[PDB]
Ligand binder design. Structure first.
Ligand SMILES: Cc1cc2nc3c(=O)[nH]c(=O)nc-3n(C[C@@H](O)[C@@H](O)[C@H](O)COP(=O)(O)O)c2cc1C
Length: 147
């Protein structure tokens, strides 16, 4: 199978996560196309993938904001065809906050209402993804034995 990894990272956390996740896949027999959202384009993007990996960090204090690079993709997500698509969402945040990884929640929601089938519960990392690296290896892993 063929997977798409699209990520929004500001400080490099979600970028790290998507890489760990990328290999996760690739070492398993997976063909993987990883991309920065900063550059993606919504026009049938999801097209011809068996799984879509959609990542993003949270910003904001009062209001939930999505990693910046990712917003314009968030905005035009019904243009990508996530109909009966297989999508799992991930990102980084800090639980010191009230709407911890609230960016994972919104992603997942527009996905549903859109058509995707979420194969698994979003992976919400609290901290440097790097020290949770195992939590990560297992999630990539649970989404495989899931399709
Ligand atoms: C201005 C700001 C507000 C944040 N907003 C929240 C929050 O609402 N939810 C939470 O999960 N993460 C929140 N975080 C921090 C995480 O989003 C951020 O540290 C994270 O690691 C993103 O890594 P990245 O560079 O891949 O986007 C806050 C941190 C700061 C700087």
């Amino acid at each position: 199978a063929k997977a798409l990894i699209v990520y929004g990272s500001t400080t490099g956390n979600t970028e790290y996560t998507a890489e760990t996740i990328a290999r996760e896949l690739a070492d398993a027999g997976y063909e993987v196309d990883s991309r920065d959202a900063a550059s993606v384009e919504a026009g049938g993007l999801f097209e011809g993938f068996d799984l879509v990996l959609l990542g993003c960090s949270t910003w904001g204090d009062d209001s939930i904001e999505l990693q910046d690079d990712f917003i314009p993709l968030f905005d035009s997500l019904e243009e990508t065809g996530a109909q009966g698509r297989k999508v799992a969402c991930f990102g980084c945040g800090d639980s010191s906050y009230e709407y911890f990884c609230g960016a994972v929640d919104a992603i997942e929601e527009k996905l549903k209402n859109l058509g995707a089938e979420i194969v698994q519960d979003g992976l919400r990392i609290d901290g440097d993804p790097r020290a949770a690296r195992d939590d990560i290896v297992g999630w990539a892993h649970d989404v495989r034995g899931a399709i």
